[PDB]
Amino acid sequence: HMSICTSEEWQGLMQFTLPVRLCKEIELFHFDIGPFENMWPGIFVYMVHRSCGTSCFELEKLCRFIMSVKKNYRRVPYHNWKHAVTVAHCMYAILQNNHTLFTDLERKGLLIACLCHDLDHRGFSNSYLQKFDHPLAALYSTSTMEQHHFSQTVSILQLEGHNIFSTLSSSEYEQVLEIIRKAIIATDLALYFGNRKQLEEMYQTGSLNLNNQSHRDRVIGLMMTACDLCSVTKLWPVTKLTANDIYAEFWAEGDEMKKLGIQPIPMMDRDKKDEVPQGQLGFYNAVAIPCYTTLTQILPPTEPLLKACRDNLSQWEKVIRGEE
Numbered sequence: 653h654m655s656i657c658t659s660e661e662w663q664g665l666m667q668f669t670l671p672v673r674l675c676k677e678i679e680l681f682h683f684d685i686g687p688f689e690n691m692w693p694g695i696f697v698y699m700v701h702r703s704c705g706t707s708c709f710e711l712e713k714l715c716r717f718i719m720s721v722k723k724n725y726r727r728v729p730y731h732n733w734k735h736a737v738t739v740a741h742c743m744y745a746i747l748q749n750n751h752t753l754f755t756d757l758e759r760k761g762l763l764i765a766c767l768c769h770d771l772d773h774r775g776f777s778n779s780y781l782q783k784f785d786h787p788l789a790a791l792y793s794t795s796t797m798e799q800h801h802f803s804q805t806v807s808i809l810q811l812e813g814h815n816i817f818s819t820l821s822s823s824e825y826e827q828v829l830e831i832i833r834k835a836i837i838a839t840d841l842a843l844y845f846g847n848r849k850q851l852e853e854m855y856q857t858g859s860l861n862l863n864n865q866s867h868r869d870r871v872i873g874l875m876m877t878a879c880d881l882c883s884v885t886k887l888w889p890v891t892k893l894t895a896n897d898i899y900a901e902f903w904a905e906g907d908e909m910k911k912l913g914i915q916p917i918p919m920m921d922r923d924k925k926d927e928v929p930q931g932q933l934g935f936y937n938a939v940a941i942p943c944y945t946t947l948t949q950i951l952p953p954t955e956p957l958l959k960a961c962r963d964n965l966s967q968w969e970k971v972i973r974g975e976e
């Protein structure tokens with residue numbers, strides 16, 4: 653009950669070479685994959701190659717897994733293939749600029765989760781499926797979409813010719829799986845708040861140990877949110893247009909509410925269009941700024957994420973004041 657790729661879909665992936673003129677761009681935190689839909693699955697291979705190495709995975713199983721993932725993504729406005737590769741590119745940028753902090757196992761896993769973290773997302777919030785009343789919320793009633801996504805990842809691994817973690821010991825296979833799980837669950841924005849709080853705590857009182865496994869999981873989750881939210885760290889004209897994809901999904905979920913006679917919260921009510929710039933400023937100030945702040949505290953080399961988040965922030969101010 654998991655879609656797979658065709659043989660030819662993936663064979664096109666093996667043949668793909670990232671163009672020389674993106675070997676620098678790709679390396680930037682602000683890098684916008686938008687223009688290169690053709691290249692996205694290929695972009696992911698290259699990012700894995702550069703980081704983990706040209707023999708970390710067998711070429712054909714990797715390409716079969718990537719292209720099947722693409723397939724188990726839906727043509728929803730924001731929670732789609734383009735967001736999975738985007739998130740994974742941010743993590744790429746993160747891992748590259750922190751080259752000795754993470755293990756072989758972490759790096760390969762975390763890039764794999766980012767690709768999988770929104771697998772088969774419907775374009776409806778948790779709020780929406782639980783609060784009325786999807787078949788997917790009477791299966792996972794605690795982080796609905798997040799246990800689904802992992803569940804999903806696992807299945808794609810478990811098909812024939814697909815298990816890219818073959819050549820790991822029964823031990824290292826069941827270690828990576830646990831990095832992936834924690835990583836995906838960690839992308840539930842509701843969890844993000846305690847965690848960030850707990851890390852500001854551990855940072856300030858001087859008690860953060862990266863030798864500690866569960867403090868690692870803490871840092872990893874943050875890295876995962878920081879990656880989930882990276883729309884807010886692009887260049888302004890990219891940042892705008894991505895906000896356009898997010899709201900169409902919000903709103904279209906808001907529209908399903910009205911169709912059952914239920915007022916959505918203003919976030920998903922398109923009739924409340926011009927409270928967006930206000931909303932974004934709010935979000936940036938309550939969620940995004942803090943996020944990249946804590947992360948830059950802990951991994952200082954992630955700092956341009958904070959820089960670009962601040963530029964975007966002030967653009968919204970200007971929109972709000974009447975000057976963009």
Ligand SMILES: CC(C)c1nc2ccc(OCc3ccc4ccccc4n3)cc2n1-c1ccccc1
Binds near residue numbers: 883894895898924935
């Ligand atoms: C990561 C992404 C899915 C996301 N989660 C979000 C959770 C909250 C949010 O508040 C905005 C807002 C709040 C209140 C409003 C009230 C009225 C109208 C619009 C309003 N807009 C934006 C959020 N965005 C987002 C991130 C970046 C870009 C776009 C969207």
Ligand SMILES: [Mg+2]
Binds near residue numbers: 770797840
């Ligand atoms: Mg998600």
Ligand SMILES: [Zn+2]
Binds near residue numbers: 735739769839880
């Ligand atoms: Zn996501």
